[PDB]
C-alpha cells in the first residue's frame, strides 16, 4: 500500500581527495509520512551536520530532501554512508560509497605453503602490486605469473588486493620485494631469502 522512493541527487559512488568537502544528498517521495530519518556510518548515527525537510509546504506534499555534510575528509573517513528512512508501513535505505585517495597500505605479508609469497595491500585507487627479486649481486623486472585477487574493514573505503607468487622459480639467496603503488604513493614489504 505505502511506498518510499529514494532518488540520489549525486552519484552513490563518491571519489574525493584527502581534505575535500562533499554533500551526500537525496530527494525521496514517501507515503505515509516518513519518520526516524537517520544517516549511519560505522553503525553509528549522525546527530549533527545533516538536514532533512519537505520539498514543499503544500499540505498534500510527499517529496522530501535529506543532506549529509561531509567536511575535510581524511583518508580514514571513506566507506559506506547509509541513509535510512521509514514510515508506518515501509523501510527504505540507500548506501553511498565514499572513497578517499590514499597511498597503498600493506595489511599483511606472508610465507605460504609450497614456497609461495603473498602480500596484501589496501588503498584507493586500487593498488597494483609488483614483485621484484633482488639477488646478492640491481633486481629484476616485475615478475609473472602472479595470482592477483580482489578481497572483500578496517580499512574502510579502500580496495583490497591480494597478490601471490611462487618463490620456487627463483634461484639464489636474495631479497624479494612486493611493492604496492597507486597514483597517490607507494609502499613495500620485503622477504629475506635463503636457497
Amino acid at each position, epitope marked *: 500500500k505505502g511506498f518510499i522512493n529514494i532518488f*540520489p*541527487m*549525486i552519484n552513490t559512488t563518491v571519489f574525493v581527495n584527502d581534505g575535500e568537502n562533499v554533500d551526500l*544528498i537525496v*530527494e525521496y517521495e514517501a507515503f505515509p509520512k516518513p519518520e526516524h530519518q537517520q544517516w549511519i556510518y560505522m553503525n553509528r548515527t549522525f546527530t549533527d551536520k545533516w538536514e532533512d*525537510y519537505p520539498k514543499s509546504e503544500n499540505e498534500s506534499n510527499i517529496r522530501y530532501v535529506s543532506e549529509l*555534510h561531509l*567536511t575535510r575528509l581524511k583518508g580514514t573517513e571513506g566507506g559506506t554512508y547509509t541513509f535510512l528512512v521509514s514510515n508506518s508501513d515501509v523501510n527504505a535505505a540507500i548506501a553511498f560509497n565514499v572513497y578517499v585517495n590514499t597511498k597503498p597500505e600493506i595489511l599483511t605479508y606472508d610465507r605460504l605453503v609450497n614456497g609461495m609469497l603473498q602480500c596484501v595491500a589496501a588503498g584507493f585507487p586500487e593498488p597494483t602490486i609488483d614483485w621484484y627479486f633482488c639477488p646478492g649481486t640491481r633486481c629484476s623486472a616485475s615478475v609473472l605469473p602472479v595470482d592477483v585477487q580482489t578481497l572483500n574493514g578496517p580499512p574502510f573505503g579502500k580496495l583490497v588486493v591480494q597478490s601471490s607468487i611462487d618463490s620456487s622459480a627463483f634461484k639464489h639467496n636474495g631479497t624479494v620485494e612486493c611493492k604496492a603503488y597507486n597514483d597517490v604513493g607507494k609502499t613495500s614489504a620485503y622477504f629475506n631469502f635463503a636457497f
Partner: antibody, heavy 117, light 107 residues
Framework: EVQLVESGGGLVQPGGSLRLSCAAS????????MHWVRQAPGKGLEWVAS????????YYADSVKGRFTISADTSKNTAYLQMNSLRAEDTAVYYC??????????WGQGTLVTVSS | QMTQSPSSLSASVGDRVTITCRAS??????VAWYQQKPGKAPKLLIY???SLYSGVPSRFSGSRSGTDFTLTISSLQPEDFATYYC??????????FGQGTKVEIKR
C-alpha cells in the same frame, strides 16, 4: 588541481539566443551541484540556475524561469546554460561554480555576455 | 528579504572591519561570505556562518550579532581592497546574494 572554464559568450542581439558551456577538471560534477551566477556591469552577484548532473534536476531564478535551460554532460564533465529570448537586462558576466555545503567554493573566471543591437 | 550593510566603507591598514548581514528568519546557519577583487571571480572566505575556507588567512572570521551574521577582518591589509558579499541558502528561496559591501582602504 581544480579548474573551471566558461566559454561560448559574446555579443548577442536582443531576442537572440546563446549557449554557454563550463568545462570542469579536478572533480566529478556528478558528485556535486553546478550553478550559474551572473553579474551585471558595475552591479552585484545574482544567482541564475543550478543542476545536479547525476539526477538531471534543475532550478531557476524567477527572472530567467521559462527562458533559460541549464543542463550537464557527465561524460564530458561539462555543464551548460542555454539562454533564449535574450534581453539587454541579461547583459552580464556569467560564472559557473561548484556548490557544496550551501556555498560556492570553486568558480570559473567568467564569460561576458553582451546583449545589444 | 536578505539585506547587507554597510554598502560601502573606508578603513585604514591595520584596522578591524565588520560587515553585517541580515538573513531570512528561517535560515539558521547557511551563510557564506565571498571576496571579489575587481575583474576577478568571487572567492569563498567563510561558509556555514563561521567555518573558514581552506587557504583563507585567519584575519577573516564569521560570527553573530546575534540574529544577524557578521564578517570580520582584523588587521586589515592593503590587499583586502574588494567588494564583499554574503549569501544565504534557504529551502524555498534557494540561493540569495547580498547587495555587496565595497571596502576602500583609507590611506
Amino acid at each position: 588541481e581544480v579548474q573551471l572554464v566558461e566559454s561560448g559568450g559574446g555579443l548577442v542581439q536582443p531576442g537572440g539566443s546563446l549557449r554557454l558551456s563550463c568545462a570542469a577538471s579536478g572533480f566529478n560534477i556528478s558528485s556535486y551541484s553546478m550553478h550559474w551566477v551572473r553579474q551585471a556591469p558595475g552591479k552585484g552577484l545574482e544567482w541564475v540556475a543550478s543542476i545536479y548532473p547525476y539526477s538531471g534536476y534543475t532550478y531557476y531564478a524567477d527572472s530567467v524561469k521559462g527562458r533559460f535551460t541549464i543542463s550537464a554532460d557527465t561524460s564530458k564533465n561539462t555543464a551548460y546554460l542555454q539562454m533564449n529570448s535574450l534581453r539587454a537586462e541579461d547583459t552580464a558576466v556569467y560564472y559557473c561554480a561548484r556548490y557544496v555545503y550551501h556555498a560556492l567554493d570553486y568558480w570559473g573566471q567568467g564569460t561576458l555576455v553582451t546583449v545589444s543591437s | 528579504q536578505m539585506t547587507q550593510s554597510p554598502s560601502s566603507l573606508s578603513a585604514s591598514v591595520g584596522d578591524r572591519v565588520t560587515i553585517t548581514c541580515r538573513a531570512s528568519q528561517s535560515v539558521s546557519s547557511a551563510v557564506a561570505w565571498y571576496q571579489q577583487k575587481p575583474g576577478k571571480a568571487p572567492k569563498l572566505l567563510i561558509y556555514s556562518a563561521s567555518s573558514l575556507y581552506s587557504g583563507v588567512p585567519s584575519r577573516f572570521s564569521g560570527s553573530r550579532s546575534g540574529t544577524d551574521f557578521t564578517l570580520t577582518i582584523s588587521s586589515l591589509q592593503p590587499e583586502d581592497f574588494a567588494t564583499y558579499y554574503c549569501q544565504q541558502w534557504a529551502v524555498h528561496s534557494l540561493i540569495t546574494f547580498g547587495q555587496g559591501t565595497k571596502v576602500e582602504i583609507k590611506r
